Structure 1
């Protein structure tokens, strides 16, 4: 996975035929019919959840929303009322699909005195699991869902080792590591294909479609990786001391942000930006002198490369690649979207290098920022304002200066995502140490505080998605999915990473 000879040859061929593609068109039609067609409502919720978890929401979003809307406007509730598993699955799938369900659907499962969940639930594994997964769709002040999380976490930890079904035990272990709401879609799809195949409820048409679609999508990723590896070797940044494997790390993160084939060009551009972010992060952290870094920053602020030959080669090359790629991406927006994006790529790079320079000056002067002071800068230095403003530039319908100026100002929805990506990275001049310095907290207490900030910012993202937004798809999804990418990659670590890379990007799923 780390060999550019091997990567640069990916895309050359694929074992995905026109026969595979026709078969895929036929299976898609039956799955679409299964989602729209008759089924008992609990079975339909479980089917739609399986479609999502197999990575296929992008193929059936309209059918799934229509089916859930039907179910939501029912009037007949006997199928779910008094059933924890049914109540919790309904609550989750409706909230995920923009249909509001109040937290009070769970009040009947509580002790009316203490507000604690009933002891009699402690044995219901599938109920606890659905309640756990449901809890992460909660908003600020939804106290029943905060209790549901703490209760279902404690109970699932308790019962995990008591489960008889191996498949169910693996699912519970997976959930305790990360809830489904926090998992990167493409990576979870590869994991869940093998789990689903072993489920007793398993639908073989849906399994077969999931394997075939997985392989077809993966052939697009392999062509992208080819083009990106050839680009990267073209830049000569593969040969620089630092950011060993930056390209493939960037691309693997990009796949968490957006995996769909129709977003290939956008994904390649995000991946280039990410490769440069990680490369230049090393320049500012390890390699450059303060004078070199100040010049790098000043050149970028003025978007004026007159003085670039004052920098040494190993710094000039990253700078000019950043400049050239930013111009290319802004130009793509002009050619493809009618809107010159260079002012916006130049601006987010200037902002990011300013945030690196501030970190470098803090380090050099031995400054201890407050957690708030650190995060105000570190939500920029993490690179997600740069990555998200770029993704908006490339995907927004009818781009305008007004629209770009708004997204670039980092309203709550966007800022929440950036802060989350930063604090998740730090949990993986750092969040925990800053909070320790500010309050005298222990590492253990400081870590729990930062963890509570993750849960808080997630509740704000969740609520922002039920609110009318000036944003549309795919940007709404990008903002959530960069956070999932962060969770996934900040839980050998390199053996785990390579397996993820090999199973998701390199090896097709065996079809019979």
Structure 2
């Protein structure tokens, strides 16, 4: 967490031409395996492994085709383990599978899962993971969640294989569906190695690809670190280590090398959001904040000198950065994005002002009122719209306008990030609920957790509906949520060193 160290990064890369060469050789082999004949359950398992290792970006097409072909039922209809894995993978890849596929395993009278299945751990694990792919009203899945969760909790201590035990403990903490991809990949690499049926070729490739991707991140980090010091925001009292935290968060949103420029831009915005949050929350005067907001709405800087230095610098950095991001869009994408960057920052500042205002005037909002504002203040509408502006094919005023309106797919993601943040961490989601219902601290928290689950189902359903959206925006929307879950469970320092700094030994 030292800037001199960070700035240094990217200067010297661990990877070698030898490493690169071996990687492309290995990739082809993995491609062969993915498309090659294999027992069906094994293939599903292999494909799942590829995703878990963070390699889906590499083989998205081969993977889809393999699943498509897989979509002769003898291999899976008979066993729940196969059924659940099949259900999850198909759904994750856009192939619908009805929940009724799980009925045979239920007691018809009770509608409950047979106690007989609790003995096999993998069976329970697949069922549990598969349940997070459910939509609203899919009660079978909801039943599967509570059943598998309870069983897994019961059987965790009865497990003898330590590796399996680690996996179960990991799943109970967070299902795979909710885990940030890059981070999960690092953890899994070590785990996969110890699996009995592990494929050495995939593992090797996973290690190589990780190191290679990492080198790109290291280079990105160095530039960002130099940029941050250049702004001078590093010497400001607020937001210590905001940049690295922001970059780490962005890694969760997008980790791919081909998206490095976009990632760097997201990281800059993230760092600013964090710093400005502190300006509004702690440092600034209402008079100062209202001015900060007004200057932003107008995108007019005539009055900036009115503000004190500690506030003026963050305001100018936000202004300059937004202009730069907007310009990049004009240059690379042939579409001036400044109006859009400016607008989402205006909305964001307004959300902050409102919170500051409630706080300076003693208002206590209801949960819906708080959330209506808070989904905006978390900063995700800003991050996502910007992300859209920089990646969408043939951008237009109309497209940007639709995204900025916060349709359900986007809105759901923003709400989730906010609630996830509040659960992990004046007045937040829980207190607002307590007051609306007077409910207990424990009961309210339970209620919020319910919202998370509810919102995810909606997000899951949105993926199957017709949409204006395409990759990579669809992924960004889902990924920011995962990023939120990861950050809100010194533990960040360990994740930083393991994923960004230290290469995997070969």
Give the TM-score taking structure 2 as reference length: 0.99
Residues 129, 172 of structure 1: 8 Å contact kept: yes
Measure, in 2, the Cα distance between the counterparts of 1:498 and 1:121.
40
Deviations 1:396-436 (A, max 9, x none): 00000000000000000000000000000000021110110
Partner of 1:453: 451
| Aligned-residue offset at 1:157 | 0.4
| Aligned-residue offset at 1:124 | 1.2
Deviations 1:37-91 (A, max 9, x none): 010000000000000000000000000100000001xxx1111113111010000
Residues 82, 108 of structure 1: 8 Å contact kept: no
Residues 252, 501 of structure 1: 8 Å contact kept: yes
Deviations 1:204-259 (A, max 9, x none): 10000000000000000000000000000000000000100000000000000000
Measure, in 2, the Cα distance between the counterparts of 1:409 and 1:166.
49
Measure, in 1, the Cα distance between the counterparts of 2:498 and 2:25.
26
Residues 369, 434 of structure 1: 8 Å contact kept: yes
Measure, in 2, the Cα distance between the counterparts of 1:259 and 1:123.
38
Structure 1 gap ranges (5+): none
Measure, in 2, the Cα distance between the counterparts of 1:200 and 1:114.
37
Residues 193, 211 of structure 1: 8 Å contact kept: yes
Aligned residues: 504
Measure, in 2, the Cα distance between the counterparts of 1:204 and 1:49.
15
| Aligned-residue offset at 1:275 | 0.2
Deviations 1:98-133 (A, max 9, x none): 000000011111110111110101111100000000
Equivalent residues in 2 for 1:250-329, closer than 5 Å: 250-329=246-325
Partner of 2:503: helix, strand, or coil? coil
Partner of 1:11: 10
| Aligned-residue offset at 1:351 | 0.1
| Aligned-residue offset at 1:314 | 0.4
* 1:339 matched to 2:335: yes
| Aligned-residue offset at 1:15 | 1.3
Partner of 1:59: 58
Structure 2 gap ranges (5+): none
Deviations 1:237-294 (A, max 9, x none): 0000010000000000000000000000000000000000000000000000000100
Please point out which of 142, 145, 165 is paired with 2:141: 145
Residues 186, 259 of structure 1: 8 Å contact kept: yes
Deviations 1:481-509 (A, max 9, x none): 00000000000xxx311110000000000
Partner of 1:31: 30
Residues 371, 431 of structure 1: 8 Å contact kept: yes
Measure, in 2, the Cα distance between the counterparts of 1:140 and 1:64.
28
Q: Indicate the RMSD between aligned Cα atoms, in angstroms.
A: 0.5
Measure, in 1, the Cα distance between the counterparts of 2:115 and 2:474.
39
| Aligned-residue offset at 1:477 | 0.2
Deviations 1:434-480 (A, max 9, x none): 11000111111100110010001100010100112101100000000
| Aligned-residue offset at 1:19 | 1.2
Measure, in 1, the Cα distance between the counterparts of 2:500 and 2:99.
39
Partner of 1:465: helix, strand, or coil? helix
